[PDB]
Ligand binder design. Structure first.
Ligand SMILES: [Ca+2]
Ligand SMILES: [Ca+2]
Ligand SMILES: [Zn+2]
Ligand SMILES: [Zn+2]
Ligand SMILES: [Zn+2]
Lengths: 276, 204, 51, 276
DNA sequence: GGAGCGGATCTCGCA
DNA sequence: GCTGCGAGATCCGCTCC
DNA sequence: GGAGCGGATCTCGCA
DNA sequence: GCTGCGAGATCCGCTCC
């Protein structure tokens, strides 16, 4: 055990084996072998970079914008994250003024709330940021040299080019082909359960009305007592909290200390008596 | 089911329009149109997804204007000149952005042609060309033109590009403006589209 | 909805009906474990109810 | 049904929708929509290439050979498919004579039976093929411009370079570093259940002896009657067949008509009486 | 037992 | 003070006629 | 309830 | 008349002390 630890350490120094090999050879614990191999400076220096990956924002009023080239043609593409609706336009160049005109036309057609884009001569500048602040749109810029950040628009690039290849012979005008592919990718898709992306966008916009939420101003208000649960060990009651929503078998509590929403089963929830 | 006889009786008693009956009884649009056509008084003398197309001159600027009759939704663009190819491209983009079902316009060179008529039959939209008879479309489009030019005059110096001013005017007249029960001319169109979708899904 | 497992996003589970939706996150019923789960708005999609 | 089929066909001609979209819109069967979409010449022309992939031979005495470059050094690598044992050698160039010397030395060290390689100035030639026929080694050449064919040696290239990066400072001579990485990748690996690849190769070579199989020349011989089973429908008895191996609940029969080995349950197997 | 069918699974290429 | 993605093919396992 | 542990899962880069 | 591959990280769900 302890006696053969220096032997395993020197063997790994001499040959740079693996933790499993050391454990199977010298009988040392797997944890000890892992500690030995992870402490090797040579192994750390030449180790392969970590492989962890995330996901895009996928907001409701979230749009990703990008440029693309197609046979000496420049196309600007906007992609809605939630529904999947796309909007493409032929642009002469990539100047800031053209992008500003296109983006404010895009705002005019429908009202977004956030935008995601990468670094670029026109995406980031002085005038464009002022315009976005004037419109009131949250703008986020991805990590440079990470095209995977705007994955959705990149995939829609494929889905647009592949379909547009079919409609070129049908129409003599390129803008006509763009409108046709917008038809076949927005209205005539009808994918999944049988709802086109335009239908999803229309439904989401319709339900977004705040006047519906403002129709009723009277609702019962209740307060509750709850405690944390760490590793199955009960804690202590932490103040009174306003009930967010009451279902069956569980409840939702907003912790101010962590400023986060948590779910608590009825076995750890109690109710204060109502005012009388 | 009884809504159809109720609407028939109410139209016999009062002779209202199809849109009001559709909104207040929820009857199918086809049934409302059938009731309207079956009235001899109305026949011998305001539809959803019904559009009007017009041209506008603005101190040498050519503007193409699309107006929805039921909802005050205005779509304005800049056109280099009155040409059949440009009109076809613009109308295909317009059908790309919206989901129309009918169109009304005047008798014009680019409006009336074999190519554009074939293209509109290809899209599958009813077209009516001629002198308007209902004394509502002319006044509505005149108001649209007047408001559009007034807003364009107001907002031109703030921005640089003319298309920028046009987009700003569209923003002001389609979203920012409100009326009735605090509703916008763009939310009404979305509500109507959602109602049509749910009715179509329920029926077939 | 979707969850994060082993540092990577999971598959798009659903469809399902939302129970309560507030700012930042919504609470939903899960079928795999019959447990309530709260999920932020950054990993959800909104769909009208089916037929 | 039949009435709306021309409508769906013309709609797909006009817009080039998807089969699911047509099925959800016009109510036509999914099979009909699939037939319509697959018959579209435009869709067929622009469709993405098929994605089917296979696997390497993974034989017992199967070896894959390849060249590689490492900082103005040329290394020839041989990889055994079954055990995973590797053998690398520094080579001055890529001439045919050097490859012939290296490959016959490789044969001298241990006896293989088959080799897999790609097209090359030295892999395929007149003298090398004569040498391989002289030695009696089956040679297979992969598809040109398909480096994925020799996947095993390509992966061992990574596993060799990554480990060799660690041992360069330890030894002044490059050949010493190659021998050290051979040590740490062949003998000191001890991966999996706790057996090094050299152990697997040694065991496989030891059990390959034919004298063990030739020790016994007496064994009971039996014959059997069997019939085919197609879609659960019984067939007819097809001649007498020699039993290959008799277990419990099943038997193995070599069909001469298909020249293939099949497994038949006891419910479809009967035995002829033994000679008396 | 024939039959279609919903869904898990695969690769590859946008930057 | 943040992020990979899905369209287009192919069968299995299923149940229903 | 603490504890380690065997194994499914992930990406990326050989050509 | 044939072919993608695995090493190196990371947690879950497990059971045993
Ligand atoms: Ca890009
Ligand atoms: Ca190679
Ligand atoms: Zn080490
Ligand atoms: Zn009438
Ligand atoms: Zn087609």
């Amino acid at each position: 055990w302890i006696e053969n630890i220096p032997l395993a350490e020197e063997e790994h120094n001499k040959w740079h084996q693996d933790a499993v090999s050391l454990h199977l050879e010298f009988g040392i614990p797997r944890t000890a072998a892992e500690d030995i191999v992870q402490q090797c400076d040579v192994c750390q220096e030449n180790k392969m970079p970590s492989t962890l990956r995330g996901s895009n924002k996928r907001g409701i009023d979230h749009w990703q914008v990008d440029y693309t080239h197609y046979e000496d043609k420049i196309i600007l593409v906007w992609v809605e994250t939630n529904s999947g609706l796309i909007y493409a336009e032929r642009v002469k160049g990539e100047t800031g003024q053209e992008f500003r005109v296109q983006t404010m036309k895009w705002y005019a057609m429908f009202a977004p709330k956030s935008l995601q884009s990468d670094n670029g001569p026109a995406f980031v500048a002085e005038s464009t940021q002022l315009l976005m602040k004037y419109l009131g749109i949250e703008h986020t810029t991805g990590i440079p040299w990470n095209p995977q950040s705007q994955a959705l628009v990149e995939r829609t690039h494929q889905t647009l080019k592949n379909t547009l290849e079919k409609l070129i012979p049908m129409f003599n005008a390129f803008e006509s082909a763009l409108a046709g592919t917008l038809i076949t990718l927005n209205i005539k898709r009808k994918g999944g359960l049988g709802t086109s992306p335009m239908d999803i966008f229309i439904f989401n916009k319709e339900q977004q009305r705040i006047q519906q939420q403002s129709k009723s101003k009277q609702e019962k208000i209740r307060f509750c007592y709850y405690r944390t649960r760490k590793r199955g060990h009960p804690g202590e009651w932490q103040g009174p909290t306003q009930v967010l929503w009451g279902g069956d078998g569980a409840i939702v509590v907003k912790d101010r200390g962590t400023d986060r929403y948590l779910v608590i089963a009825n076995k750890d929830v109690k109710f204060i008596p109502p005012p009388k």
